[PDB]
């Protein structure tokens, strides 16, 4: 199909988002004395978000190059 691709693409996007959320929650949120993110936890999530998306971008680029071969 092609319709599968559009769906698979949607599922793929829902993937990153999810994995990203989980990645950054695991590395940044360690205090549960409250129900809200501190200042530090948001910054940490900011950096984690960036680092992960960048990393995820780079690997995607290499993945395409080596994929054509």
């Amino acid at each position: 199909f092609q319709k599968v691709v559009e769906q698979k693409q949607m599922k793929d996007f829902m993937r990153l988002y999810s994995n990203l959320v989980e990645r950054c929650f695991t590395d940044c949120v360690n205090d549960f004395t409250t129900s809200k993110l501190t200042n530090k936890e948001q910054t940490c999530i900011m950096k984690c978000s960036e680092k992960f998306l960048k990393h995820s971008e780079r690997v995607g680029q290499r993945f395409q190059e080596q994929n054509a071969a």
Binding site: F25, T33, L53
Partner: peptide, 24 residues
């Protein structure tokens, strides 16, 4: 209680991460 606060920060983290992807 840890669970309650954990579940809460997890959603707060969702939106947070959601706004981070919207920025870039």
């Amino acid at each position: 209680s840890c669970l309650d606060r954990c579940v809460a920060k997890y959603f707060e983290t969702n939106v947070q991460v959601g706004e981070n992807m919207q920025k870039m």
